[model samples]
Target chain A: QSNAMKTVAGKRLLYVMAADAEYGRHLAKLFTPLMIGVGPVEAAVNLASALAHLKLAGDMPDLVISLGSAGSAKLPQAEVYQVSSVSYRDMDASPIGFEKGVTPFLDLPETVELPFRVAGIDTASLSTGGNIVSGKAYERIEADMVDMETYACLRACQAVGVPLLGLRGISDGASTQHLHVIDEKLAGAVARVERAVADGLLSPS
Target chain B: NAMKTVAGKRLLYVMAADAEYGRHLAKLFTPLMIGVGPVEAAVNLASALAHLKLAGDMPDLVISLGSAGSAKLPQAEVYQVSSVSYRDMDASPIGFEKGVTPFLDLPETVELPFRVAGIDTASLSTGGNIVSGKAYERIEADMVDMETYACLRACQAVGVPLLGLRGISDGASELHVIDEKLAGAVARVERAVADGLLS
Candidate 1:
């Protein structure tokens, strides 16, 4: 139950995400999000370990959207992602699952079934290579359209008990191999995502 | 003729002075060194930091030397190295022949003119374990030599080149008995390495 806003695009869902602070600006046009500076982790067990220092609980959004750019494993290019599941790409799927195995801790019940279509875009799609080709774990994670700070925004939303939705517009496809310049993809993704953001933020879950 | 990356530059070797493993070994090698390792053990964080953390006017480089007693491996030799591993070491073997060295993304062993190896570290934690009388869980480092990891990590935080060097003494399981003989050995090596530094 959203406490409807008294203006245009009445309060429905905050649907917040992060990237360049400006890439995230697209959401502001959608549902009137409250943006913050700097952030922490994108892990499962480390979720709290990551969020322990967020200090962003103030003015939390109603719908948390973990957003940022990530490289695709199969694609080797960067692109806009409508990240559906906050997959802990680093989570362990080892045999004889260690009870304390690292696993993805979702803010929502998987049973609840998300209405979104994006599921595990496989950030490891690109081959594991480092020298400007693809598959460097660090870059592989960064090449996608999502990032570090978005998880906390989503966590804050979950803690406050609200629906969360994340959307990203691909700027680089899964094959545009270029050295990363944060401002480059961020600027482009922010613009492309604006319209969709406005629609999602103003719409009901 | 190892290519000297930082030609004529001073390279630092950090270690523990009184460490069960570091000191005992230093004492073992004492007659050869100028002093005991424990006496040089870095105790205060700030004083230590002052030595290693100086930025603009900082020494060309600084490395801490200390002893270590490991807990994870019972029969391990004290080894020296430099590597900061960001990814897991266990990938399929099909890709192993590609020269993609696994774990400890340590630099390839370059035949450097200097007697040192490129070391690596973690940004979030380093010295929290070396400080005395604290409630924090003592951290376990790859190959203990008190100061290399700490100094190297801190120095890098502010943009500095560092190379870690160490001489193993005892395995973590047999970590006691560091005394005079060991101290001399470290001092000897320290003097030699220190003498070799250019910056």
Candidate 2:
């Protein structure tokens, strides 16, 4: 069993959520008291922001929970889902013979899987890039949900040897017209995740 | 009053290695020595910027000075980068333009300002690995480095402009006799900075 599984009740946890304050307001109050915004809604920005936050804290968290809003084409909108795996959709090195989504010179798998899942929540693979996906953009992507920060969050958490759990509420499909309801959806998602943590559903068996 | 000068602007210099930010740069400027790759550059720069912000000492501009290799650019000479793009960001299969970061309205190449006069300028391709031989043919820039594009991303996030000054260290061959060449390159870049490159 992982350390998080053995002592998750006392594990140091950090929450990385949206660059927008609204996405994490309630979760902060309920959990970490202050949500670390991943800067602007882009991969590099979020990656850097998360690393900086971790560095400034001078202490490593046992786990980092990345909670945010995402867009989906097939998944129901306004509902939360736990990310089962994450990949960098914007990383394309195929012209040079490497597979798409694989970072060159890095020994990481093309897709990183979360070892544990939040029970009773639907799980979906996430594709992260610097852009928003809408319209035909959804067709080209292979994952169920799209966001700008999760893969970068995974990178940051991995750098510090911390486990990452990603929770995203579907906010749009083919467009962000449904973003109006994400605030409530995300709040509920956070609550579910919180309940799972309390129940040890996120711990390794 | 509009002439570019380094005299009054708060400048933060960053380089990927101690050798790149050698005694020449150390004597003249205090550059942050980061690790030699994109991840390292991004993480360290962001951390440094956060530290500075917390201390209320953020710089007006960031200068990324480094050693790069190119198939065409002159070795042991420094050049100002006109623009930079991530060579690894090729989402072309998904219909996005090569080197263009998907979803961002920004152009494939992030343009940089040419502050110094009399120095040659070149475009740079930044990636996670060293470029050579066939890889050189694939990159659409005058030179290649591991950190510039990532640094550009960090600078953009913090709203600070980045200036790239690179010394050509190798070509299509293996990186041999690099120390002397790197020192010479560092000296040239330091000279350029001292001669109002940031101005």
Give the C-alpha interface root-mean-square deviation per candidate. 16.7, 6.4
Let me know the DockQ for model 2.
0.17
Best candidate, TM-score? 2
Instruction: Put down candidate 2 lDDT per residue, A54-137, tens digits, no spaces.
Output: 556665566677877887898987888889998876555564588777765567777888766776778999987655567786
Q: Against the true structure, what is each candidate's TM-score?
A: 0.33, 0.65
Chain A TM-score, each candidate: 0.44, 0.80
Pairs in clash, predicted candidate 2: A131-B103, B4-B199, B5-B199, B6-B199
Each candidate's DockQ: 0.02, 0.17
The lDDT per prediction is: 0.33, 0.67
List model 1 lDDT by residue over B1-199, tens digit each.
1111233554343333334334454333321111111111111212333333433234454443334334433332323344422121122322442222333243322111234323222111122122222212343334333233334323433455554333334334443333342344344444555565443
Model 2, B1-199: lDDT tens digits are 1112255657677877665555444455666765545655676677667667666557777878778889987677777789998765654544778667654577988889654555678999887666656768777788988788878877877788788877777783422344444445445654666766655
Worst 10 residues of 2 chain B by lDDT: B172-181
Candidate 2's interface RMSD, please? 6.4
- Candidate 1 matches the true fold with a TM-score of 0.33
